Amino acid sequence: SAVKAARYGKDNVRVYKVHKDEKTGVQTVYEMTVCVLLEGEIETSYTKADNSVIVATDSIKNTIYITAKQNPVTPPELFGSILGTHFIEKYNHIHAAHVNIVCHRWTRMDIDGKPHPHSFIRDSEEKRNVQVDVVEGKGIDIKSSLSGLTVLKSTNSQFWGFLRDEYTTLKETWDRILSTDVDATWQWKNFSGLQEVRSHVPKFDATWATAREVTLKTFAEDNSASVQATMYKMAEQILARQQLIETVEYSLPNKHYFEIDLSWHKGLQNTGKNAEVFAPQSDPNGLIKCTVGRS
Amino acid sequence: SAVKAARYGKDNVRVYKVHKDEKTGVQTVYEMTVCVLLEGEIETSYTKADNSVIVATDSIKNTIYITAKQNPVTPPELFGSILGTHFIEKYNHIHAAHVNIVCHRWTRMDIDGKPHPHSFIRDSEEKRNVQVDVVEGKGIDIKSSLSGLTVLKSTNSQFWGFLRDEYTTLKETWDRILSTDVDATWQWKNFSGLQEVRSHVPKFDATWATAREVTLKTFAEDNSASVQATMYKMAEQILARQQLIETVEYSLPNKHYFEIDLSWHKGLQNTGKNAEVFAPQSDPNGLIKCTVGRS
């Protein structure tokens, strides 16, 4: 036998950081969950019980906290690039570092219509994420994403004109509910190293804001022919608004809301134009994916 | 043997309802999860295989949807009272109906600074709940609550002066992080029946807004001596602002954020006034409860 691929590290590392402005007295908090997996000349730890090549996962954890102490943790594209660069520079035998960051929401509270200097709310489980792959000799590859953005529109979605054969029972519709959990990922141009990532730092928060804004406005305003056609519109707009990204990927479930025929009970009309009460369906669900690139 | 207590029904019934204003073109959505458990002269279904006394759970489900078609589903205190009243009136042998409602958030979207007529976002997993117990001969007992309201303050929490003995290792602190998931419940005066519940309908949304506002402002502004002392302040203020509630109950976890001593690494100072990076702890957690009534 032979090792064909190997990586190891620390997952589910919870990290909080606070920034304090003691001129203004305003505090700002950041919370994330970090994973770091390393690759390199490590196969003998698997084949020969040679632990000399292992940077212990506990030491990887220590390194996350130390790096967070010594650097800004935002934007996450930058923090992940600094962290991954550390590992491949510090350790001659480590040749790639793979950093995932899940960013959790702590939105400043407004109290009596003024922002509070040190109190925050989790306004939803939506996440902002990065995957930063630092590969020695080959730069830094970054994917950015938003996930867990759960939305619903009650009309201005349609689905008709689909293939119909002996497996088909679904009725065409010109007016349905559409609800989904948005997972949207933008893939950046390869960066040559940390310096280039630093040179683009303002584009990271700006591109996440553009992706979110395009998602929300397109979802709300598109009289949707299908999940596929709406998601494609979102992707092309994001590509047109940030030339340093190469592709945009969407993964959208179709979280179904079924009409309920009540006409068996006192003639009640609850279907079609009369549909008011629906049964949200936990499973199954459609799942629609696409990756959009430039022509 | 003998049956001492028995109840049965349908749980986890997902319900959506839409309201359409075709003068303004504005749609409004509501989504909940309902459970209904019935009690009455039903013991023979357990002891003698007598199913004649059972209102099938599927029929209970049908009844939830029909009631939702025929009535407003808001406020949930009203909807639960209508639903529970139906069961004890319709069925001579059913003497109590226990209705739980979990209300899910679908907040209208703002697009380009205007509210959208039919697009919504799940802005957090915070719930609004009711437990409505309709008991024949004895009125309607309602508990209202908010749950899953997750908050954090980065300073202006303290914990010192606690008991110290041979089991104690915890250091006193005059400046700590406080984070919790708020579960707050207000218990209404018994209502004599549906008419009385209807007569108070505006107080339900108003009291939920008061509880939420008091929670948020007290959490943000109290320089907290302990979780106990802060939660008590919230409860007394809610009681002073709604005379039709009898008690306020809080259940608050203390979701710990631990300092990380890094001085073992290049002398790094990250404790006390220098604390910037912390380790959020998933478990264990303090859990602090109280029920506050009037003197």
Next chain:
Amino acid sequence: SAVKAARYGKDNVRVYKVHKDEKTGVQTVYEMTVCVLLEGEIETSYTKADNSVIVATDSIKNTIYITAKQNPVTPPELFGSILGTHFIEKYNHIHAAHVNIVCHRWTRMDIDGKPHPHSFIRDSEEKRNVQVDVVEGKGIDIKSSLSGLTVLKSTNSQFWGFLRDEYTTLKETWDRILSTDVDATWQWKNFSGLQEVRSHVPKFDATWATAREVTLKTFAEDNSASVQATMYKMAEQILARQQLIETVEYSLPNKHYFEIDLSWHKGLQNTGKNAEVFAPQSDPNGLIKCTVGRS
């Protein structure tokens, strides 16, 4: 305002203990999750910021580990009684201690048909639980339970003869699937204190084994008229086999498996006696409860 009820403590405390027999070389492991909530003369911590009455939750955590070091952790009825007794004896102002224990499964592995001396498997998420309430002046109240025992029978369940009215659509059946997650609780006679609990220690594991065996055999062998009638049989048998318990409580969901009519496709017959492929339903679910006592 006034405090009407208050309790505080530590939740979600994970605990492992190992026993090593260095005559036989056999090791045995135990893993649980513990919560302890205390009551007593503590209201001033809520109303007056008086932390002197608080046994810090961290010290409660320390106490769980110390008690686990100094005593057997099995059976959980005993461990919870020792722990709760400690708090009300150690602290004059603490008058009740409420201990919940969730016991996790670590079943010894068999390798090449022999039990392994120190390797274990989690053979399901079924739990064994206790709630032990130690109340000064009033003894020790113990509830024991098994939960998360998930079972299915593919036939020999029926449901017919139920009430039928204008809310009913469900078809009678003489042959259905029955699946549930069993939650079964037995409530012990009040114990006067720790000595009496100790005097009954072998009855705790024996009664849990009886409850489990009765559950499994009755579920498998009863040609069930309804969930209610089967669960009642289980409860009466457990009461007849342990005179020191006063009541048995069951809470059983009816996790539905729906037939799928495929006759629209090439005449396929998949209903009634021809039913082979079914759609398991995640929600909603029936929920059936009863508490059985002695006549």
Next chain:
Amino acid sequence: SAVKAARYGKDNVRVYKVHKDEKTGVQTVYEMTVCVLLEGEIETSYTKADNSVIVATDSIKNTIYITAKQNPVTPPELFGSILGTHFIEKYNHIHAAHVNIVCHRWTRMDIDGKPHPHSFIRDSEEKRNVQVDVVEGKGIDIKSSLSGLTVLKSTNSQFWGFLRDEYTTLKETWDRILSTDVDATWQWKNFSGLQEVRSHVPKFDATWATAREVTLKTFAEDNSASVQATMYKMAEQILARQQLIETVEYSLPNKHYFEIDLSWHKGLQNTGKNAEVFAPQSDPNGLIKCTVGRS
């Protein structure tokens, strides 16, 4: 813009099937969760609102149930190959079908030491899975796996000799607890189509049994130098026992159990050889991966 990749279909489709032997009266149940994603000449559904190319996801769901009615659902490698082959043969414009199957455990009950003909238990959340990729022109690619197999050994694990530098605080150990959730995947030789998959059908259950047996016995018997070294041993043994698989992949978390120093309390000794009570850690966790192929 241009579509670079696209796939769509139905996820989270719950399926039960029963087999009845009415000579022996024995029933056997199978339960799974299925996902099917299709690829092909479908980009115009995204770019031009052309739904003519879409096989509706509801029809994909119908097709899963129909295929389950008409064929055995075991072994899952076979069922997934039949299902995926259907889509690329039925639809000229569909060129790949990607089928995931999660198989749930329903183990026959033993009652009074005899197997019961129609009653079953969920003996753990361990799953058996397949990913079957049917690609027109290019055969069938199958990955098989076991996941959620949670194990613990209380001794006969070590971790010493790892790299030590200014980021290292971890103490070497010659006797630790090792616990993990096993995710193990074997990748089969490409099959030319359904006929070849059928020709190997007995090897699927046999190879899953070999992988499980090798995992369990190696975990229990290896005096482990590290997670890496133990997992590698498992992989090489599986490769030596099934020549039709090309690689074996393991992904193992190191679910940490920390010693608890209690010597601050009455001199209690609970570390090193005296370690009996431990704190299981929910997060973070080491994560160790490797893919093993043949030399």
